[PDB]
Coordinates of C-alpha atoms (C1' of nucleotides) in Angstrom, one line a residue:
Chain A
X1 CA 63.4 80.5 107.2
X2 CA 66.1 83.0 107.7
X3 CA 68.6 83.8 110.3
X4 CA 70.5 86.7 111.3
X5 CA 74.2 86.3 112.6
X6 CA 77.4 88.6 113.4
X7 CA 80.2 87.1 111.6
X8 CA 83.7 88.9 111.6
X9 CA 82.8 92.3 111.8
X10 CA 79.4 92.7 110.0
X11 CA 76.0 91.3 110.0
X12 CA 74.3 88.9 107.5
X13 CA 70.6 87.5 106.7
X14 CA 71.2 83.8 105.3
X15 CA 69.1 80.8 104.7
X16 CA 69.4 77.0 104.2
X17 CA 71.9 75.9 101.1
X18 CA 73.2 79.8 100.4
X19 CA 77.0 80.5 99.9
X20 CA 78.0 83.8 102.0
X21 CA 81.5 85.1 101.6
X22 CA 83.3 86.4 104.7
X23 CA 86.6 87.6 106.5
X24 CA 89.2 85.4 106.4
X25 CA 89.1 82.3 109.3
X26 CA 91.5 80.1 110.2
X27 CA 90.0 76.9 109.3
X28 CA 91.0 74.1 107.0
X29 CA 88.9 74.0 103.8
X30 CA 87.3 70.6 104.6
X31 CA 85.3 71.2 108.2
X32 CA 82.3 72.6 109.9
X33 CA 82.0 75.9 111.8
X34 CA 79.5 77.0 114.3
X35 CA 78.3 80.3 114.8
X36 CA 76.8 80.1 118.4
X37 CA 75.6 83.9 118.6
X38 CA 72.4 84.4 116.4
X39 CA 70.2 87.6 116.2
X40 CA 66.8 86.7 114.8
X41 CA 65.5 83.4 113.3
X42 CA 61.9 83.7 111.4
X43 CA 59.6 81.5 109.7
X44 CA 56.0 82.7 109.7
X45 CA 55.7 83.0 113.4
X46 CA 58.9 85.5 113.5
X47 CA 58.8 86.4 117.1
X48 CA 62.8 85.5 117.8
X49 CA 64.1 88.9 118.3
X50 CA 67.1 87.7 120.9
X51 CA 68.0 91.1 122.6
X52 CA 71.7 90.3 123.3
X53 CA 71.3 87.2 120.8
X54 CA 69.1 84.3 121.3
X55 CA 68.9 81.1 123.5
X56 CA 69.3 77.7 121.4
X57 CA 69.8 79.0 118.0
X58 CA 72.9 78.0 116.3
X59 CA 73.6 77.9 112.6
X60 CA 75.5 74.9 110.7
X61 CA 78.2 75.9 108.1
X62 CA 81.2 74.4 106.4
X63 CA 84.1 75.8 104.7
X64 CA 84.3 75.7 100.9
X65 CA 87.2 77.6 99.7
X66 CA 90.2 80.1 100.3
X67 CA 90.9 83.0 98.3
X68 CA 92.1 86.7 97.5
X69 CA 89.7 89.0 96.2
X70 CA 90.0 91.2 93.1
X71 CA 92.9 93.8 92.5
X72 CA 92.1 97.9 93.1
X73 CA 94.7 100.6 92.5
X74 CA 95.3 103.6 94.7
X75 CA 96.3 106.9 93.3
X76 CA 97.8 109.7 95.3
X77 CA 98.2 112.9 93.6
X78 CA 98.8 116.5 94.4
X79 CA 98.7 119.2 91.3
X80 CA 101.8 121.3 90.7
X81 CA 103.6 119.8 94.0
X82 CA 106.0 117.1 92.1
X83 CA 104.2 114.6 94.1
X84 CA 102.6 111.1 93.3
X85 CA 102.5 107.4 94.4
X86 CA 100.8 104.5 93.4
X87 CA 99.7 101.0 95.3
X88 CA 97.6 97.8 95.0
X89 CA 95.5 95.7 97.0
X90 CA 93.9 92.3 97.0
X91 CA 91.6 91.2 99.7
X92 CA 91.3 87.7 101.3
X93 CA 88.2 86.1 102.0
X94 CA 86.1 83.0 102.8
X95 CA 83.4 81.2 101.9
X96 CA 81.0 79.0 103.5
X97 CA 77.9 76.9 102.7
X98 CA 75.0 77.2 105.0
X99 CA 73.9 73.3 106.2
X100 CA 71.4 73.7 109.2
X101 CA 69.7 76.6 111.2
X102 CA 68.1 75.4 114.2
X103 CA 66.1 77.3 116.5
Chain B
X1 CA 110.3 105.9 32.2
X2 CA 108.5 109.3 33.1
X3 CA 105.6 109.1 35.0
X4 CA 106.3 107.9 38.9
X5 CA 109.9 108.9 38.7
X6 CA 109.6 112.5 37.7
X7 CA 106.4 113.0 39.4
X8 CA 107.7 112.0 42.8
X9 CA 111.1 114.0 41.4
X10 CA 109.4 117.0 42.2
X11 CA 108.3 116.7 45.6
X12 CA 112.1 116.5 46.6
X13 CA 112.6 120.2 45.0
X14 CA 109.6 121.5 46.4
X15 CA 111.4 121.0 49.7
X16 CA 114.3 123.1 49.1
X17 CA 112.4 125.9 47.2
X18 CA 110.2 126.1 50.6
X19 CA 113.4 126.0 52.6
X20 CA 115.2 129.1 50.4
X21 CA 111.8 130.8 50.4
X22 CA 112.6 131.8 54.0
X23 CA 115.0 134.4 53.9
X24 CA 113.2 136.2 56.5
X25 CA 114.8 139.9 56.0
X26 CA 111.3 141.0 54.3
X27 CA 109.6 140.6 57.6
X28 CA 108.7 144.3 57.5
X29 CA 107.4 144.9 60.9
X30 CA 107.7 148.1 63.0
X31 CA 104.0 147.4 62.9
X32 CA 103.7 150.9 61.3
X33 CA 100.3 152.1 63.0
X34 CA 100.9 154.0 66.7
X35 CA 102.4 152.1 69.5
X36 CA 99.6 150.2 71.7
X37 CA 100.5 152.1 75.0
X38 CA 102.7 154.8 73.8
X39 CA 104.5 157.2 75.9
Chain C
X1 CA 150.8 68.9 104.2
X2 CA 151.3 65.9 102.3
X3 CA 150.6 65.9 98.7
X4 CA 149.8 62.4 97.1
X5 CA 151.2 62.0 93.9
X6 CA 149.3 59.9 90.9
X7 CA 151.6 57.7 88.7
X8 CA 154.2 56.8 91.3
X9 CA 152.0 56.4 94.7
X10 CA 154.5 58.5 96.8
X11 CA 154.1 61.6 98.9
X12 CA 155.1 65.2 98.4
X13 CA 155.4 67.8 101.4
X14 CA 154.9 71.4 100.8
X15 CA 154.5 74.4 102.8
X16 CA 151.3 74.3 104.8
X17 CA 150.7 78.3 104.7
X18 CA 151.1 77.9 100.7
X19 CA 148.5 74.9 100.2
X20 CA 146.7 74.9 103.3
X21 CA 144.8 78.6 103.9
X22 CA 141.3 79.2 103.9
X23 CA 139.3 80.8 101.4
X24 CA 139.4 84.6 101.3
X25 CA 136.6 85.3 98.9
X26 CA 136.6 89.1 98.7
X27 CA 140.4 89.3 98.0
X28 CA 140.1 86.9 95.3
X29 CA 137.1 88.7 93.7
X30 CA 138.9 91.9 93.7
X31 CA 142.0 90.6 92.3
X32 CA 140.0 88.8 89.5
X33 CA 138.1 91.7 88.4
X34 CA 141.2 93.8 88.5
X35 CA 142.9 91.5 85.9
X36 CA 139.9 91.3 83.8
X37 CA 140.2 95.2 83.4
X38 CA 143.5 95.3 82.8
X39 CA 143.0 93.4 79.3
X40 CA 140.7 96.1 78.2
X41 CA 141.8 98.4 75.4
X42 CA 139.9 101.7 75.2
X43 CA 139.7 102.9 71.6
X44 CA 137.1 105.1 71.0
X45 CA 135.7 108.6 70.3
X46 CA 133.2 111.1 69.4
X47 CA 132.7 114.5 68.1
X48 CA 131.9 117.5 70.5
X49 CA 130.2 120.3 69.5
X50 CA 133.4 122.3 68.7
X51 CA 134.5 119.4 66.5
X52 CA 131.7 119.1 64.1
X53 CA 132.4 120.2 60.4
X54 CA 130.4 123.4 59.9
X55 CA 130.2 127.1 60.3
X56 CA 130.0 129.4 63.1
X57 CA 127.3 131.6 61.7
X58 CA 124.0 132.4 63.2
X59 CA 120.9 130.8 61.7
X60 CA 118.8 133.8 62.3
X61 CA 118.8 136.7 63.6
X62 CA 117.7 137.0 67.8
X63 CA 114.3 138.5 68.0
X64 CA 111.5 139.6 65.2
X65 CA 110.6 135.8 64.0
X66 CA 108.7 133.3 65.3
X67 CA 110.7 130.9 66.0
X68 CA 112.8 129.6 69.2
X69 CA 116.2 131.1 69.8
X70 CA 119.3 129.4 68.1
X71 CA 122.6 130.1 67.7
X72 CA 124.9 127.3 66.5
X73 CA 123.9 125.1 63.5
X74 CA 126.2 122.1 65.7
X75 CA 124.1 122.6 69.0
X76 CA 123.8 119.2 70.6
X77 CA 120.3 119.3 70.5
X78 CA 119.9 119.4 66.7
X79 CA 119.8 116.6 64.0
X80 CA 123.2 115.8 63.1
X81 CA 124.9 118.1 65.8
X82 CA 127.4 117.1 68.3
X83 CA 127.2 114.8 71.2
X84 CA 126.6 116.5 74.6
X85 CA 129.8 114.7 76.7
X86 CA 131.9 112.9 73.8
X87 CA 134.1 110.2 74.6
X88 CA 138.2 110.2 74.5
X89 CA 140.1 107.0 74.6
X90 CA 141.1 106.1 78.0
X91 CA 143.4 103.5 80.2
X92 CA 141.2 100.9 82.5
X93 CA 144.0 99.5 84.0
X94 CA 144.2 98.9 88.2
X95 CA 146.7 99.0 90.8
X96 CA 146.9 95.6 92.9
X97 CA 149.3 95.8 96.1
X98 CA 152.1 93.1 95.6
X99 CA 151.4 91.5 99.1
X100 CA 147.6 91.3 97.9
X101 CA 148.3 89.8 94.9
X102 CA 150.0 86.7 96.3
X103 CA 147.4 86.1 99.0
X104 CA 144.8 85.6 96.1
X105 CA 147.1 82.8 94.5
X106 CA 147.8 81.3 97.9
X107 CA 143.5 81.2 98.4
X108 CA 143.3 79.8 95.1
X109 CA 145.6 76.9 95.2
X110 CA 144.4 75.8 98.8
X111 CA 140.9 75.9 97.4
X112 CA 142.0 73.9 94.1
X113 CA 143.6 71.3 96.6
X114 CA 140.3 71.4 99.1
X115 CA 138.5 70.4 95.9
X116 CA 140.5 67.9 94.6
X117 CA 140.7 69.6 91.1
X118 CA 144.9 69.4 91.4
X119 CA 146.3 66.8 90.0
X120 CA 150.2 66.3 90.7
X121 CA 152.5 64.0 88.8
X122 CA 156.4 63.9 88.0
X123 CA 156.7 63.7 84.2
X124 CA 154.5 64.8 81.5
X125 CA 155.8 64.7 77.6
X126 CA 154.9 63.4 74.2
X127 CA 158.0 62.1 72.0
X128 CA 157.0 63.8 68.8
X129 CA 155.0 66.9 67.9
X130 CA 151.7 65.1 66.8
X131 CA 148.3 66.3 68.1
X132 CA 146.7 62.6 68.1
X133 CA 149.0 61.7 70.5
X134 CA 148.5 64.2 73.1
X135 CA 144.8 63.9 72.8
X136 CA 145.0 59.7 73.0
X137 CA 147.3 60.5 76.4
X138 CA 144.6 62.7 77.7
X139 CA 142.2 59.9 77.1
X140 CA 143.8 57.7 79.2
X141 CA 143.9 59.6 82.2
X142 CA 139.8 60.4 81.6
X143 CA 141.0 64.3 81.2
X144 CA 139.1 66.8 78.7
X145 CA 139.9 70.4 79.7
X146 CA 143.1 70.7 81.8
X147 CA 146.0 73.5 82.3
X148 CA 149.4 71.6 81.9
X149 CA 151.9 73.3 84.1
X150 CA 155.7 72.6 83.4
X151 CA 158.9 73.5 85.0
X152 CA 160.5 74.1 81.8
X153 CA 158.5 74.9 78.4
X154 CA 158.9 72.0 76.1
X155 CA 158.8 72.4 72.5
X156 CA 157.2 69.7 71.3
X157 CA 154.7 69.6 74.0
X158 CA 153.5 73.3 73.4
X159 CA 153.2 72.5 69.4
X160 CA 151.3 69.7 69.9
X161 CA 148.5 70.8 72.4
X162 CA 148.1 74.1 70.0
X163 CA 144.8 72.8 67.8
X164 CA 143.1 71.7 70.9
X165 CA 140.7 73.9 72.3
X166 CA 140.3 72.6 75.7
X167 CA 143.8 72.4 76.4
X168 CA 146.6 75.1 77.5
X169 CA 149.8 74.8 78.6
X170 CA 152.4 77.0 80.6
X171 CA 155.1 77.5 82.5
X172 CA 155.8 78.0 86.5
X173 CA 155.9 81.6 86.0
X174 CA 153.5 82.1 83.7
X175 CA 150.6 81.3 85.8
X176 CA 147.6 83.9 86.5
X177 CA 144.9 83.7 88.6
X178 CA 142.1 83.7 85.8
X179 CA 143.5 80.4 84.1
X180 CA 143.3 78.7 87.7
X181 CA 139.5 79.1 87.8
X182 CA 139.0 78.6 84.3
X183 CA 139.5 75.0 84.0
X184 CA 138.4 71.8 86.0
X185 CA 141.5 70.4 86.4
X186 CA 145.1 71.4 86.7
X187 CA 148.4 69.2 86.4
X188 CA 151.6 69.9 87.5
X189 CA 155.1 68.1 87.5
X190 CA 156.9 67.9 90.7
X191 CA 159.3 70.5 89.9
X192 CA 156.9 73.3 88.6
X193 CA 155.3 72.4 92.2
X194 CA 158.7 73.6 93.7
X195 CA 159.2 76.3 91.9
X196 CA 155.6 77.4 92.6
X197 CA 155.8 76.9 96.4
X198 CA 159.7 79.0 96.3
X199 CA 157.8 81.7 94.5
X200 CA 155.2 82.2 96.5
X201 CA 157.5 82.3 99.3
Chain D
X1 CA 136.4 78.0 92.5
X2 CA 134.0 79.0 89.6
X3 CA 133.9 81.9 87.7
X4 CA 130.4 83.0 87.7
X5 CA 130.2 82.3 91.7
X6 CA 132.2 84.7 93.0
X7 CA 130.7 87.7 95.0
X8 CA 132.1 91.1 96.5
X9 CA 132.1 91.5 100.1
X10 CA 129.1 93.2 101.6
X11 CA 129.0 96.9 101.8
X12 CA 131.6 97.4 99.4
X13 CA 129.8 98.7 96.6
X14 CA 127.4 101.4 96.8
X15 CA 125.2 102.3 93.8
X16 CA 126.0 105.9 93.3
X17 CA 123.7 109.2 92.4
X18 CA 121.8 109.9 89.3
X19 CA 120.1 113.0 89.2
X20 CA 117.2 114.2 87.0
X21 CA 115.5 110.7 86.2
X22 CA 111.9 111.1 87.4
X23 CA 109.7 111.7 90.6
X24 CA 110.2 108.5 92.8
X25 CA 114.1 108.8 92.7
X26 CA 113.8 111.7 94.5
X27 CA 116.3 113.4 92.7
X28 CA 114.7 114.8 89.7
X29 CA 113.9 118.2 88.7
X30 CA 116.8 120.6 89.7
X31 CA 118.5 117.6 91.1
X32 CA 119.2 119.0 94.6
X33 CA 120.4 122.2 93.3
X34 CA 117.2 124.2 94.9
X35 CA 115.3 126.9 93.2
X36 CA 116.8 130.0 91.3
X37 CA 120.2 131.9 92.2
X38 CA 123.5 132.2 91.4
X39 CA 124.6 128.6 92.9
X40 CA 121.9 127.0 90.8
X41 CA 123.9 128.0 87.5
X42 CA 125.9 125.7 85.2
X43 CA 129.5 126.8 86.5
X44 CA 127.8 128.8 89.4
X45 CA 129.8 129.2 92.7
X46 CA 132.3 131.8 94.2
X47 CA 136.0 131.9 95.1
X48 CA 137.4 130.3 98.4
Chain E
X1 CA 127.4 101.4 74.6
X2 CA 124.6 103.1 73.0
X3 CA 121.3 102.4 73.9
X4 CA 118.2 102.9 71.7
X5 CA 115.1 104.0 73.4
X6 CA 112.3 102.6 71.0
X7 CA 111.0 99.0 72.2
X8 CA 110.9 100.4 76.0
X9 CA 109.0 103.5 75.2
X10 CA 106.7 101.8 73.1
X11 CA 105.6 99.4 75.4
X12 CA 105.3 102.0 78.3
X13 CA 103.0 103.8 75.8
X14 CA 101.1 100.9 75.1
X15 CA 100.4 99.9 78.7
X16 CA 98.5 103.5 79.3
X17 CA 96.3 103.6 76.2
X18 CA 95.3 100.1 77.4
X19 CA 93.7 101.6 80.4
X20 CA 91.4 104.5 78.9
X21 CA 89.3 102.0 76.8
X22 CA 85.7 103.9 76.4
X23 CA 86.8 107.4 76.9
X24 CA 85.4 110.4 74.7
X25 CA 87.4 111.7 71.5
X26 CA 91.2 112.2 71.9
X27 CA 91.2 111.0 75.4
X28 CA 91.5 107.3 74.1
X29 CA 93.7 108.2 71.0
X30 CA 96.6 110.3 72.1
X31 CA 99.1 109.8 74.9
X32 CA 99.4 113.5 76.4
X33 CA 95.6 113.3 76.9
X34 CA 94.4 109.9 78.0
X35 CA 97.7 110.0 80.7
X36 CA 96.0 113.1 82.5
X37 CA 92.5 111.0 82.2
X38 CA 94.2 108.0 83.7
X39 CA 95.3 110.2 86.9
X40 CA 92.2 111.8 87.2
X41 CA 90.2 108.4 87.4
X42 CA 92.8 107.3 89.7
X43 CA 92.0 110.1 92.0
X44 CA 88.2 110.1 91.7
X45 CA 88.0 106.3 92.5
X46 CA 90.0 106.9 95.5
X47 CA 87.8 109.4 97.0
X48 CA 84.7 107.7 96.0
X49 CA 85.7 104.5 97.8
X50 CA 84.7 106.4 101.0
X51 CA 81.8 108.1 99.4
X52 CA 80.3 104.8 98.6
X53 CA 79.6 104.1 102.4
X54 CA 77.7 107.2 103.1
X55 CA 75.1 107.0 100.5
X56 CA 73.8 103.4 101.4
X57 CA 73.7 104.1 104.8
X58 CA 71.6 107.3 104.1
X59 CA 69.5 105.1 101.6
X60 CA 69.0 102.6 104.5
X61 CA 68.0 105.5 106.6
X62 CA 65.5 106.4 104.2
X63 CA 63.9 103.4 103.8
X64 CA 63.6 102.6 107.5
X65 CA 61.9 105.9 108.2
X66 CA 59.3 105.5 105.4
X67 CA 58.7 101.8 106.6
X68 CA 58.0 102.9 110.7
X69 CA 55.6 105.6 109.9
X70 CA 53.2 102.8 108.3
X71 CA 53.0 101.8 111.4
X72 CA 52.5 105.0 113.5
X73 CA 55.9 105.7 114.6
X74 CA 58.8 108.2 113.5
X75 CA 62.2 107.1 113.0
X76 CA 64.1 108.7 115.7
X77 CA 61.9 107.0 118.1
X78 CA 61.8 103.6 116.6
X79 CA 65.8 103.5 116.9
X80 CA 65.9 105.0 120.2
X81 CA 63.3 102.4 121.6
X82 CA 65.4 99.7 120.1
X83 CA 68.2 100.7 122.3
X84 CA 66.4 100.6 125.4
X85 CA 65.1 97.1 124.8
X86 CA 68.8 96.0 123.9
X87 CA 68.3 95.3 119.8
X88 CA 71.5 94.8 117.9
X89 CA 70.1 94.7 114.4
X90 CA 72.1 96.4 111.6
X91 CA 70.4 99.0 109.7
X92 CA 71.3 97.3 106.4
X93 CA 69.3 94.5 108.0
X94 CA 66.5 96.5 109.2
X95 CA 66.0 97.9 105.5
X96 CA 66.2 94.3 104.2
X97 CA 63.4 93.1 106.6
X98 CA 61.3 96.3 105.7
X99 CA 61.2 95.5 102.0
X100 CA 61.0 91.6 102.3
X101 CA 59.1 90.9 104.9
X102 CA 56.6 93.2 106.5
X103 CA 55.2 91.0 109.4
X104 CA 58.5 90.7 111.2
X105 CA 59.0 94.5 110.8
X106 CA 55.5 95.1 112.5
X107 CA 56.9 92.7 115.3
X108 CA 59.8 94.7 115.6
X109 CA 58.0 97.8 115.9
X110 CA 55.6 96.9 118.6
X111 CA 58.7 95.4 120.9
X112 CA 60.1 98.7 120.4
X113 CA 57.1 100.8 121.2
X114 CA 56.6 98.6 124.3
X115 CA 59.9 99.3 125.1
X116 CA 59.4 103.0 125.0
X117 CA 56.2 103.0 127.0
Chain F
rC1 C1' 93.2 85.5 27.4
rC2 C1' 89.4 89.5 28.9
rC3 C1' 87.5 95.0 30.5
rG4 C1' 89.7 99.8 28.7
rG5 C1' 91.6 105.2 24.5
rC6 C1' 96.4 99.6 20.1
rG7 C1' 96.2 104.2 27.8
rA8 C1' 96.8 104.2 33.0
rG9 C1' 94.9 100.9 36.4
rG10 C1' 92.7 95.8 37.1
rG11 C1' 90.7 90.2 37.1
rG12 C1' 92.5 85.4 35.5
rA13 C1' 96.3 81.8 33.8
rG14 C1' 101.8 80.8 34.7
rU15 C1' 107.0 80.8 37.8
rG16 C1' 108.2 80.4 43.0
rA17 C1' 108.8 77.9 49.7
rA18 C1' 106.1 82.4 49.8
rA19 C1' 103.1 87.4 45.0
rA20 C1' 99.1 89.5 51.2
rA21 C1' 108.2 88.8 48.1
rG22 C1' 105.0 92.4 41.8
rA23 C1' 109.7 96.1 40.8
rA24 C1' 107.0 102.7 45.1
rC25 C1' 109.3 95.3 46.0
rC26 C1' 112.1 92.0 54.3
rU27 C1' 109.0 93.0 59.0
rG28 C1' 105.6 96.8 58.8
rA29 C1' 104.2 99.9 64.3
rA30 C1' 101.4 105.4 66.0
rA31 C1' 99.1 109.6 64.9
rC32 C1' 95.1 110.2 60.3
rC33 C1' 91.1 108.4 57.0
rG34 C1' 87.2 104.4 55.6
rU35 C1' 83.5 99.6 55.1
rG36 C1' 80.4 96.2 58.3
rU37 C1' 78.2 94.3 62.7
rA38 C1' 75.9 95.6 68.4
rC39 C1' 74.3 99.0 71.8
rG40 C1' 72.9 104.3 72.7
rU41 C1' 71.2 108.8 71.0
rA42 C1' 66.1 114.8 68.3
rC43 C1' 62.8 118.5 75.9
rA44 C1' 68.1 118.3 76.7
rA45 C1' 72.4 122.3 80.0
rG46 C1' 79.3 122.8 82.1
rC47 C1' 87.5 119.5 82.6
rA48 C1' 83.4 114.5 79.6
rG49 C1' 85.1 111.1 84.6
rU50 C1' 84.3 108.5 89.3
rG51 C1' 80.4 105.7 92.7
rG52 C1' 75.2 103.6 91.9
rG53 C1' 72.5 101.5 87.9
rA54 C1' 67.6 99.2 84.8
rG55 C1' 67.0 97.5 79.8
rC56 C1' 69.4 95.3 75.4
rA57 C1' 72.7 91.9 72.1
rC58 C1' 75.9 88.1 72.2
rG59 C1' 78.6 83.1 74.7
rC60 C1' 78.8 79.5 78.5
rU61 C1' 75.6 77.1 81.6
rU62 C1' 71.9 71.3 84.7
rA63 C1' 69.3 74.8 88.0
rG64 C1' 71.5 79.3 89.6
rG65 C1' 73.3 82.4 86.8
rC66 C1' 77.8 83.9 85.4
rG67 C1' 81.4 86.3 81.2
rU68 C1' 81.9 90.4 77.1
rG69 C1' 79.9 95.1 74.9
rU70 C1' 76.6 99.1 75.4
rG71 C1' 74.4 102.6 78.6
rA72 C1' 68.7 105.2 79.8
rC73 C1' 68.3 107.8 84.9
rU74 C1' 70.8 109.5 89.5
rG75 C1' 75.2 111.4 93.9
rC76 C1' 80.0 114.0 93.8
rG77 C1' 83.1 116.9 90.7
rU78 C1' 86.3 124.0 87.6
rA79 C1' 93.0 120.2 82.7
rC80 C1' 98.7 119.6 83.1
rC81 C1' 103.5 122.2 83.8

RNA sequence: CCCGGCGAGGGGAGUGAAAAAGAACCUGAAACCGUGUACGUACAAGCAGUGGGAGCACGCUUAGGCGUGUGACUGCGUACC
């Protein structure tokens, strides 16, 4: 039993009880989210290949936490030209826990 | 009252001795053999 | 405007333009910084390349050897050499215009009045030159650090206050912009008030 | 009003140039003099 | 007003050497070499952040192509058939399905083959 | 007091708040040189890293796996002024 849905820019394959890290979403960290669009749900009789999405599939998940990723460093250099610079970066994310997959 | 005192003492004199040993006039170059790419 | 007394419950009238101005912080800042710079005493020196004890002989010849080129034992890049840009004694005092020096005083006095930090009485003295009497009198009015200004400098008062760290006395003529900001409370006799008012014009 | 509360008027104090200190400052390594030539020498220049 | 340069310079040097742990030989002991090594590593990391997105797509393509010919169809025809059937499945998802679920992949292949018709 | 050449240098005992303050005696960095533990290495070709990535060891943990160290194999890649 697993499903495929299209979150904020990418696609994920997930099952019940999993924890999935996504892009930032503007939702408080206590409540549920709905993913109306689904691409495929499969259990033994896996024939739910919805062409532009499926008909009745929805996914139930609730927001767990917000935070920033791990810092990376950007270095630009040009040999024997008297030029260099540096810059850091950290990325926002959002965790959800899947609670219900319904056909 | 000898050991450490004079033993370390000589290491001061060696510095000045090597310092003077560099008069450098005796450099004796002109690399007497013919010039590398002469006329 | 009307200036309330302290121990006589009367009123004093002074020039509005000398005690009721606004606060021009930029002018005051410039004046106080200039005053601070005038107290310096620039007495320092170093030795240039030409002023180091040594000789003008070349250390070694120009070419031939494997070392770098050198021409003086007192070069600034050698140990025990000279300082590249040595210092001479200087003079750091600045200039302040007469007119823009008085405006700062007027603004400061206006601010002191607005902040209730200025106290006006009519008479202030001690009978004998003893520090304990002055300390007792100051404790009566609940004052700890102040700047006493009097119309004429009494020698008894001046002697009694010399050993007190937080207390200083002055005259109408001898006031400065910094002393007005350093302390919390300022007390002036009425005659001193009139003298200051006519002096600032 | 207090000796550690006054501030200068805005825009009346500019920093000032410091040549030959690193790359980021934009003024290191020939400090704005260009490359070789008479005008890039200690004491170089021509009369009026 | 003389200023000494000991503490600041020592701290700045120690900052770099702590970034060169694990490098071979003098490239983790002396400042003049560790500095250049760290700069090179920065450049390489910046460049590789782009290439990482290409190698994985290459791998996904290869796995999908291998799994599709098990069911008697080429990669290009399979991908084209999916588009004529209006199927939007990411190549990462397709490779994952190919590895971990053969029956679903067979269903997808049969659908695409019918779509080509 | 003990080993030693009635040596040099040590290990105890004792003073002192402290002897890892013992006379080369405040503090005590870096290059440089060692002992011990964990992993890798004797069919393998190059600015020695970076992006992937098994296995092994240690710690936490309730599953589930995390954290630290090492790094087989593989794509790309000819220092600085």
